[PDB]
Amino acid sequence: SKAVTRHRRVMHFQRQKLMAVTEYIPPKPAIHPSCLPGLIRLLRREIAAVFQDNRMIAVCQNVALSAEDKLLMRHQLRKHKILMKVFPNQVLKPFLEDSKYQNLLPLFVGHNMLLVSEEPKVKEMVRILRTVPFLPLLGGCIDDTILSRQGFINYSK
Amino acid sequence: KFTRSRIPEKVFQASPEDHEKYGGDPQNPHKLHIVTRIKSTRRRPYWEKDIIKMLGLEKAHTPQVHKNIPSVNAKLKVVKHLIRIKPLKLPQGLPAEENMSNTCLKSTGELVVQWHLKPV
Amino acid sequence: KPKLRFIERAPLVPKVRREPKNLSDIRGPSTEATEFTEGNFAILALGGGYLHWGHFEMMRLTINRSMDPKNMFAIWRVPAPFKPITRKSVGHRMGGGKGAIDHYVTPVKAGRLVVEMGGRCEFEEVQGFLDQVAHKLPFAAKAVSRGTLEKMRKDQEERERNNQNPWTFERIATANMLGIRKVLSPYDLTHKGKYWGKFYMPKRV
């Protein structure tokens, strides 16, 4: 058999013993190492500007709609100067403690959309929400005073 | 082709790590080697068979004294895979004519010039 | 011309003198064309072998199929088939000279780059059809970037510096430690035990 073959040629036995003795040994540490120890500021400036803007705020669980249905809700609230805002609560949890909202820290989680306002059409917004047997009103906060949904009935009325 | 193998000189240059490992001093080195054949000349080329005959190592496991001079070291470099080399260390002096008969080369590598058979 | 040009079966000028199959044109690390030259991606050979014409058509055909010429260009690194491999007539008895020239071949050693790629393309784009191509080759090959090439060479340096094994093949072979050049090649003093025949051992330090 030639020195170059098509199959891996069988080594001489001392060749093979050399190859086994001179194998690579990796280092072993005494302790395993794994067992040892722009858009963000766009949201901060934008939503922080929305904090100082609104006198009244409300919020819902606006995930339970269709696209054209959210277009209808977008137009029926476009009829007012109220604004709706889908934004991550991931950044909104440091937003509240920045804006000194300690009663609003247990408010903003899961799917939610802001209803920031200065003029309450929120009674008529409830009039739009009464025809759909879901999507409840989550509590707001006008001028560092919290609004329960009962408070939305009282203030909205 | 299988040929006679030159070995480069960097192989025979000790490092201070090796002076920490074995018991050697680069200044004031040893005079005499003890060489022992520990491997067969069978299945070895004829030149290695010859060098084993020149150094006087035909019988295995029998120590032989040599000089630590570059000629003898050249022959030892040819058959360094068949032999074992240790420095002949001498705790007491080299033996005088009084102590010539009563010697014994111990296993350690030392050659004691008074070999009683009593315990210390 | 951002495509693979046609590689002919045999050059225009023939080679009238027959050649001995010096298979040491497959053995060992390649010297020619190991690094990139105005390329970004290649098909590195992890082993040696012979390229036929049919291999060259597998690469030209199955690369120029799936290739954006406005985004990607490509260069042959391995030349045209120039080594005349002979075959004797089928079922004829031995002796009577050396057989007539059958077909030409290129030798490719290990560490050779075969086909360079270039242009406005990421590596993950070009992994696919260069892995298909790299599997259709006769030898073990691999699609390699520039950063992946220097990555695995730095890995080989890490292996050569990290190992807690006092005995390497280089220290044993070159010193002739266990009388072991009786079993080794004279090439094993320069291959350093990473090449056996035409193969390549990447895992072996």
Place this chain on the structure above:
RNA sequence: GCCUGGUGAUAGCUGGUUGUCCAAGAUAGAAUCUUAGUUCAACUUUAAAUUUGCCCACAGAACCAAAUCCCCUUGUAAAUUUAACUGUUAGUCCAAAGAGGAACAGCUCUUUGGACACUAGGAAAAAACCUUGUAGAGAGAGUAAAAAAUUUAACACCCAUAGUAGGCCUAAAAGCAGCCACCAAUUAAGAAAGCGUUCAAGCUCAACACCUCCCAAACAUAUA
């Protein structure tokens, strides 16, 4: 034809060659009607005479790799010459460098080195691999080589409007028959990466909101 004689024809071919014990002893070749053989050489053997042999260090050996030659020291004990003759040669295998062949062959041909045609131990058995050589007796001891190790492939849950059925070509080909730009709206979904339709409409993806009959038996735990 057969018989007797020549005739113990001749046979480079086959077969066979009878006490004991010890010793030394194996692989270049050149010619040849030659390759089933001989002759010379090489190697081998005995006897004799003498003086170096072997290993080798610097220096040194050509232009168009491994090494070798040469070689004082040194380590050794052989070498050359003289006399006299026989015998042996298609060696085989392994490692290496190659050639022919299919980078087949227990295939063919060279080179270097081993081993075998010489012992014993190991590798299942075992010419050629590894360990090991010089011979006897021992119901002592220390060692050498020396026991195959492995077992694999889960994967992001969502979520999708609008300029628009992007222009041109195309019966229309709309992100998806092709060219080109590939901007833009909300907070954000590509003038589109895969199904899909003549074309559509419908489905996913990125991104948004939560994140002939198997073949030792066996055995994972006690300090090398």
Place this chain on the structure above:
RNA sequence: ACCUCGGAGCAGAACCCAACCUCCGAGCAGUACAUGCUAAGACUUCACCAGUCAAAGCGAACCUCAAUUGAUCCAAUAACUUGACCAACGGAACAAGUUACCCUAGGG
């Protein structure tokens, strides 16, 4: 298809190294007529045979090429010399086809 001789690779660096291995060639021509005579020392195709180189000397002037070839005996010649594709090229002085009728001694 070949049989002798030489060059190159194989066979990289002293010498040597095969193949019905890879490629080139040779079987002469030309010039000179001291291409006279002698002679230390050497090389050598792995033997022998053949081959090569050569200082000094006497005598005179003032070979190129790689191979370029053939033993002994016998002939021819007064002598000096000359004599083979003896190419199967170490050459028998001169001898073809075939045998399922073959035969014998052996080998696979």
